[PDB]
Amino acid sequence: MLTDPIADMLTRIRNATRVYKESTDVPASRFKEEILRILAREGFIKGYERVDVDGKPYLRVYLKYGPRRQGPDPRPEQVIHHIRRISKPGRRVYVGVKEIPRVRRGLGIAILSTSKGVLTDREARKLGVGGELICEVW
Amino acid sequence: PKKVLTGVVVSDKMQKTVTVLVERQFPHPLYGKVIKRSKKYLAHDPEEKYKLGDVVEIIESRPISKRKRFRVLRLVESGRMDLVEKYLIRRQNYQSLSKRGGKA
Amino acid sequence: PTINQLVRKGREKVRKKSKVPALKGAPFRRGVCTVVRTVTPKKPNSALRKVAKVRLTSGYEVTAYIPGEGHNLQEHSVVLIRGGRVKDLPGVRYHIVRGVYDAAGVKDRKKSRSKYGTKKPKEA
Amino acid sequence: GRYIGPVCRLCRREGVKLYLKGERCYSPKCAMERRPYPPGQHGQKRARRPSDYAVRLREKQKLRRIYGISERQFRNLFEEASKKKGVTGSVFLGLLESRLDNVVYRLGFAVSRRQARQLVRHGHITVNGRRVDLPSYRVRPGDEIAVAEKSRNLELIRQNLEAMKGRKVGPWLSLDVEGMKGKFLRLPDREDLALPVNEQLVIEFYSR
Amino acid sequence: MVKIRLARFGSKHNPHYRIVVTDARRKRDGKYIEKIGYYDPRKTTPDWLKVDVERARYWLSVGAQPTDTARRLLRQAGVFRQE
Amino acid sequence: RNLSALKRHRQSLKRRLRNKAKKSAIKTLSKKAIQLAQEGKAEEALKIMRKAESLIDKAAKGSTLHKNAAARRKSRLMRKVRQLLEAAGAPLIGGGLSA
RNA sequence: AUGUGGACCCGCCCCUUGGGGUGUGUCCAAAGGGCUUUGCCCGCUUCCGGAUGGGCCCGCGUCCCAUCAGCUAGUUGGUGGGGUAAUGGCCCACCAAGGCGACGACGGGUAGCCGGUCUGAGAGGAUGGCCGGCCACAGGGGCACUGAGACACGGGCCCCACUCCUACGGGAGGCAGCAGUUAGGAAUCUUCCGCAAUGGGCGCAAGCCUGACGGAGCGACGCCGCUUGGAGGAAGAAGCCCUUCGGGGUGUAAACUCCUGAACCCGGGACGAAACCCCCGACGAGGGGACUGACGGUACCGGGGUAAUAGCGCCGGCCAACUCCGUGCCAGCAGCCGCGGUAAUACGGAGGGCGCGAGCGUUACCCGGAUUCACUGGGCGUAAAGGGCGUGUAGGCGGCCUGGGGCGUCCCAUGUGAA
Ligand SMILES: [Mg+2]
Ligand SMILES: [Mg+2]
Ligand SMILES: [Mg+2]
Ligand SMILES: [Mg+2]
Ligand SMILES: [Mg+2]
Ligand SMILES: [Mg+2]
Ligand SMILES: [Mg+2]
Ligand SMILES: [Mg+2]
Ligand SMILES: [Mg+2]
Ligand SMILES: [Mg+2]
Ligand SMILES: [Mg+2]
Ligand SMILES: [Mg+2]
Ligand SMILES: [Mg+2]
Ligand SMILES: [Mg+2]
Ligand SMILES: [Mg+2]
Ligand SMILES: [Mg+2]
Ligand SMILES: [Mg+2]
Ligand SMILES: [Mg+2]
Ligand SMILES: [Mg+2]
Ligand SMILES: [Mg+2]
Ligand SMILES: [Mg+2]
Ligand SMILES: [Mg+2]
Ligand SMILES: [Mg+2]
Ligand SMILES: [Mg+2]
Ligand SMILES: [Mg+2]
Ligand SMILES: [Mg+2]
Ligand SMILES: [Mg+2]
Ligand SMILES: [Mg+2]
Ligand SMILES: [Mg+2]
Ligand SMILES: [Mg+2]
Ligand SMILES: [Mg+2]
Ligand SMILES: [Mg+2]
Ligand SMILES: [Mg+2]
Ligand SMILES: [Mg+2]
Ligand SMILES: [Zn+2]
């Protein structure tokens, strides 16, 4: 069985960008959606759509990359340098609003789930709520 | 506020007393992970009324014997022996764990 | 190890093994000399190193190096001990304090004098 | 301690012109003048590339000997400038400059800090009127540092404060030559001090 | 019974007391019930006696029992306005 | 030697005896009352229960009992007396009891 | 005897565990003293309330060993009774046969716990010394009495061990109170002053008692402040440096140029102490000079005044500082790597240098560096590490959608988090 589906998605993305795929298919959930919603809004992907694949629902995910570079290795800078699952099954991680961390001095974000819905670090502190802390992304 | 626990009766084999099993989940001091953990309370049952299986509310009371300090407040839901069986098998393991074998 | 494993088993801490049972973890032990033998060194050293077997008030019987040039340690001279591994004689892990009790402090030493326990030369 | 020994051997080891002899260090015989090699019988041989420790160490001794102070008192001042809010490198220099033995020397009551030090100890200096005889007393701002009434007619002062006619003083002191009473206006900033010292090193030395 | 008295808190040769409600059976400098003021017998500072005068009269109302010294100090702050 | 608060000892002894007797009087009367009830002799049992009540409440005037200790002792008493009587008695003199 | 009232059994109502009201019955009070005497002071009795102090119960937390895995007879529960201020197997008789344990029971080892303390970037590690809170003990073991409170350090009884008295039957003791002696030990203080201050016990008060305390004494044991002010050459009866009995350094560094003046002398000289008491006013009235200082003639102020202690470690790399002679795997050094075998910056001396300075070194122990037990934050093909392989018990973990609950989780308010 797939134990942590959220972790799988983050990996699935990490894995796709390193070989510079155009887009990648991740099995769909209302939850994985509310993450991409953020991932998209904060400029890390071009966006996502709800393609069906042999009848079963996925989420195509259009990845972004930097400009073509020069010298040896022209491959572009990634837009997602780094993406890490933080609360994992059987080591769940919750933060209070006071404990919400500053990722990359704020050149990066930290998606987290709250009883006010899924938000970024800035989103949550402005809103004065903590919650389960899903992942880092910078 | 006199403390109030909620639990499962796992024993009816006493005169006017019922062993209640109270489970409590808290996260671990250093390792963060949530761990379930539990304790058995002897509760006063003045009318041998509560039967093995149900889920009761337990309440902090003036002492009634050595290690018997709670009275059985109200009843939550009726029967469910699954909880007892869980608690039963757990016990049965001990039959092994000695010098020979036993029941797995 | 998994988190769960860690929760079940824990880490296990470290134990200090002390290279001086001068007992009490006292800083000095008084002792009565038994032998005042001489001993040979190892690995790539040669000489005749002045050692002493000592009977301790901590109820111990340990060899202990006698630092300095000349010593005056008879078969029964009483003496103080401090920690100190002599790299060369193995099994010698204490020093005799030159200057306390029966051990006279090295004579005519002008340089590093607080070790070797010698008074300020009377150059006044 | 107070060091209290041959001062110009320290002018020489640290390598920069130092004002410990206060008066004489302006004449062509400061010994640093036309003999600027270190003390000892290796004074004039070629010196190898110093370790980073050396560099930091020397830069620290350089500072501490300027103000003539036991390392005890010095490290106490430094930890206190760390704990303190504000760029910690230069809070140090401000505390160091706030020492009475030093503020007396700044106002040219004395020619050396050393001299100024013994001037305080002998109760020749007042502060807000009252007598103070601690070289380490800390001058706060607003404080008026006077010369002792009974000491007013003393030799060294008559001489020293007369030569102070004309001369200017740092823009944090306000000396008045008539009645011999300067005022401590302000804690000096790093640009105010022309100390031949890189305190960044000094910090870095205790950063070990 | 419960008393109001002076508990010593200075330094050697430098006394400062705290005016204190406490059970009399207590250590002099031990655990008290409530601080209700202080006293600097040497008046080294312009503020050398201070009494929470409302609170002083509270404890008095339920049988707090001032030392003869404490009463001085209390009198001075004008606890019992003998007018 | 000789701290003259061994006087306290002398007194302790003196008192010890006063309490000791006061209690035996209660114990012997209370017993007697119960044992009278358990025979249906009701008038005799109350005439004596009543003595025992008094002595008890009295006992508690000094330090021999004081307290709920005496209250207890009375509660245990009149309750027992009524029951041994209620095995067919009909509280004749009805001194200490209220029916 | 009086019953304001209160206790107890039976009822009646409210309450809800034994909280409060009520009725018949029963039971239960007391102490005198002083007067500046018939009216004040301190007392005495019952009851209700407050305040302070305390008993008991509960949740959660609280080291190591599984080479300790099974434990338990008042043991677990019950009815009744004893006992207590009071709940309770606390104790007792009887009845049921339960209670506990791998979420570590039972056993063994170690230890007073905490506020805090040291360390650390932190998470964490280590610790419980001063001071403050609680607990336990008072030569060892048991026990009750007295009392509001003790199972009572300077109270009682009994047994044991040790010491002293002994007319040999029998008696006396108990510094882990202040000081002190002795032993043990690397090592730990005066048989000091004082009742003036604060605090306590009793007294109406005057007072009394207080080794509580406030002070002084010893010990660089720790911290902080402070002094030793600083301007000049160098003949070896075994002892002033550096190319063979030789080239510069020590160094502006002096036994002597002024200047200031630690010690030491002389004079003044304290805060801490205003209440208790008396007096007017009512026995707390802005009146008390009613009087009170161990520390102490000390601190502090003023006058006089002498140029006036410097040590200890280090100099091969780590690690700031190098030369000469002696020595020749010797004597020795050494925290690790290592130095010494005739040219040693590493041993011993010397000159010179570096660090710190009334201290400087050594030993010892804790945290650190050590991401070297890794939660933060490590690993296991060959470096140490995949169980010889399976099955599956307990446990850990769990795909997509919707609805309730709100245990985890998040937020706001509040109470506590003493000093
Ligand atoms: Mg008496
Ligand atoms: Mg009567
Ligand atoms: Mg112990
Ligand atoms: Mg660390
Ligand atoms: Mg003893
Ligand atoms: Mg005993
Ligand atoms: Mg009493
Ligand atoms: Mg009693
Ligand atoms: Mg006791
Ligand atoms: Mg005693
Ligand atoms: Mg003693
Ligand atoms: Mg000895
Ligand atoms: Mg002492
Ligand atoms: Mg008093
Ligand atoms: Mg004292
Ligand atoms: Mg006065
Ligand atoms: Mg008096
Ligand atoms: Mg070097
Ligand atoms: Mg050496
Ligand atoms: Mg040689
Ligand atoms: Mg050498
Ligand atoms: Mg060396
Ligand atoms: Mg000092
Ligand atoms: Mg660590
Ligand atoms: Mg890890
Ligand atoms: Mg490793
Ligand atoms: Mg191999
Ligand atoms: Mg291997
Ligand atoms: Mg295998
Ligand atoms: Mg399973
Ligand atoms: Mg599950
Ligand atoms: Mg799920
Ligand atoms: Mg909830
Ligand atoms: Mg809070
Ligand atoms: Zn100079």
What CA–CA distance (Å, rounded) separates F97 from A87? Answer: 75
Tokens of D100: 């009475």
Are B33 and A93 an interchain contact pair (Cβ–Cβ within 8 Å)? no
- D55 CA to G387 C1', in Å? 58
Helix axes F7-37, F67-86, angle to 10 degrees: 20
- The string of DSSP letters for A38-84 reads HHHHTTSEEEEE--EETTEEEEEEEE-B-----SS--PPPBS---EE
Q: H-type helices in chain D, by residue range?
A: 8-14, 52-66, 71-83, 88-97, 100-106, 113-121, 155-162, 199-206
What CA–CA distance (Å, rounded) separates D66 from B12? Answer: 88
What CA–CA distance (Å, rounded) separates A31 from E69? Answer: 74
User: Under a CB-based contact definition with an 8 Å cutoff, are residues C81 and C95 in contact?
Assistant: yes
C7 touches chain B (CB under 8 A): yes
Number of domains in chain B: 1
Count CB-CB contacts under 10 A for residue E5.
22
Q: What residues pair up with E19 in beta bridges, in sequence order?
A: E6
- D131 CA to G227 C1', in Å? 19
In chain A, what residues touch B27 (CB-CB under 8 Å)? 92
For B28, which residue in chain C has the nearest alpha carbon? C7
Chains A and B touch (3+ CB pairs under 8 A): yes
Q: What are phi and psi of B20, to 5 degrees?
A: -105, 140
Helix, coil or strand: residue C100: strand
H or E stretch at C60: none
User: CA D66 → CA D96, D101, D190, D204, distances in Å?
Assistant: 10, 12, 16, 19
User: CA D135 → CA D99, D104, E68, distances in Å?
Assistant: 7, 9, 47
Q: How many helices (H) and strands (E) are present in chain B, helices listed first? A: 1, 5
Domain housing F61: 1-99
Q: What residues pair up with D138 in beta bridges, in sequence order?
A: D99
Residues 68-97 of B with CB under 7 A from strand G: 68-69, 71, 86, 89-91, 93-94, 97
- D84 with D101, same domain: the answer is no
Dihedral in degrees, nearest 10, Cα atoms E59, E60, E62, E63: 120
- The string of DSSP letters for D20-45 reads SS-SSTTTTTSSSTT--SPSSTTTTS
Q: What are phi and psi of D169, to 5 degrees?
A: -135, 150
In chain A, what residues touch B32 (CB-CB under 8 Å)? 91-93
What CA–CA distance (Å, rounded) separates D53 from D59? Answer: 10
What CA–CA distance (Å, rounded) separates F38 from D140? Answer: 98
**In chain G, which nucleotides are within 7 Å of a protein Cβ?**
6-10, 17, 23-30, 46, 50-53, 56-60, 62, 65, 69-70, 76-79, 81-90, 95-103, 123-126, 131-134, 145-149, 152, 154-156, 172-174, 184-187, 197-201, 212-216, 224-231, 241-242, 248-253, 259-262, 271-276, 282, 284-286, 301-303, 307, 310-314, 318-323, 329-341, 348-358, 360-367, 373-375, 378-380, 392-402, 407-412, 418
Handedness of CA D80, D84, D88, D90 (dihedral sign): negative
What CA–CA distance (Å, rounded) separates B8 from B54? Answer: 6
User: Under a CB-based contact definition with an 8 Å cutoff, are residues E32 and E55 in contact?
Assistant: no
Helix, coil or strand: residue C61: strand
Q: Which residue has the tokens 């600097």?
A: E40
Helix, coil or strand: residue D56: helix
- D173 with D206, same domain: the answer is no
Count CB-CB contacts under 10 A for residue D63.
24
Domain housing D206: 1-96+194-208
User: Under a CB-based contact definition with an 8 Å cutoff, are residues A49 and A61 in contact?
Assistant: no
- Residues of chain C whose beta carbon is less than 8 angstroms from a beta carbon of chain A are 3-4
Which residues precede chain breaks (C–N over 2.5 Å) in chain B?
none
Tokens of D160: 């020293």
Exposure string of B2-31, with b = 16+ CB inside 10 Å and e = fewer, is eeebebbbbeeeeeebbbbbbeeeeeeeee
Q: Going by C-beta distance under 8 Å and a sequence separation of 6 or more, which residues neighbour residue A58?
A: A25, A26, A27, A28, A50, A51, A52
Nucleic acid strand G within 7 Å of D194 CB: no
**Which residue minimizes Cα–C1' distance to G82?**
F76
What CA–CA distance (Å, rounded) separates D203 from A46? Answer: 49
Handedness of CA A73, A75, A81, A83 (dihedral sign): negative
Mutation target vs A (from B30, B31, B34, B36; most A CBs, 10 A cutoff) = B34
A-B contacts at Cβ under 8 angstroms = 9
Domain housing A134: 81-138
- D88 with D111, same domain: the answer is no
Resolution (A): 3.3
Count CB-CB contacts under 10 A for residue A38.
18
Domain housing B78: 1-104
Nucleic acid strand G within 7 Å of C86 CB: yes
Number of domains in chain F: 1
User: CA E49 → CA E18, E44, E53, E74, E78, distances in Å?
Assistant: 10, 11, 12, 9, 12
B-C contacts at Cβ under 8 angstroms = 9
User: CA A71 → CA A18, A66, A75, A78, D9, distances in Å?
Assistant: 19, 15, 10, 17, 58
Dihedral in degrees, nearest 10, Cα atoms A20, A22, A26, A31: 100
- A24 CA to G52 C1', in Å? 76
Domain housing C17: 1-124
Tokens of A83: 């993406």
Q: Which residue has the tokens 């709800």?
A: A50
Region of residue D86 (phi > 0: left; psi between -120 and 50: alpha; otherwise: beta): left
User: Under a CB-based contact definition with an 8 Å cutoff, are residues F44 and F31 in contact?
Assistant: no
User: Under a CB-based contact definition with an 8 Å cutoff, are residues A88 and A10 in contact?
Assistant: no
Number of domains in chain A: 2
**Which residue minimizes Cα–C1' distance to G147?**
F63
For B36, which residue in chain C has the nearest alpha carbon? C7
Nucleic acid strand G within 7 Å of F92 CB: no
Q: What is the CATH number of the domain that holds F8?
A: 1.20.58.110
In the listed set A30, A48, A80, which residue is the last one of a domain according to the structure? A80
What single letter denotes the amino acid at residue D13? R
Number of domains in chain D: 2
Q: Which nucleotide is nearest to C50 (CA to C1')?
A: G332
Closest CA relative to residue D106, chosen from D187, D32, D199, D8: D187
What CA–CA distance (Å, rounded) separates D105 from D22? Answer: 9
Q: What residues pair up with D173 in beta bridges, in sequence order?
A: D184
Q: Which residue has the tokens 């973890």?
A: C25
User: Under a CB-based contact definition with an 8 Å cutoff, are residues D199 and D92 in contact?
Assistant: yes
Q: What is the CATH number of the domain that holds A102?
A: 3.30.1490.10
Closest CA relative to residue D134, chosen from D117, D148, D149: D117
Tokens of A57: 């629902």
In chain B, what residues touch A93 (CB-CB under 8 Å)? 32
Number of domains in chain C: 1
Tally the residues of chain C: 124
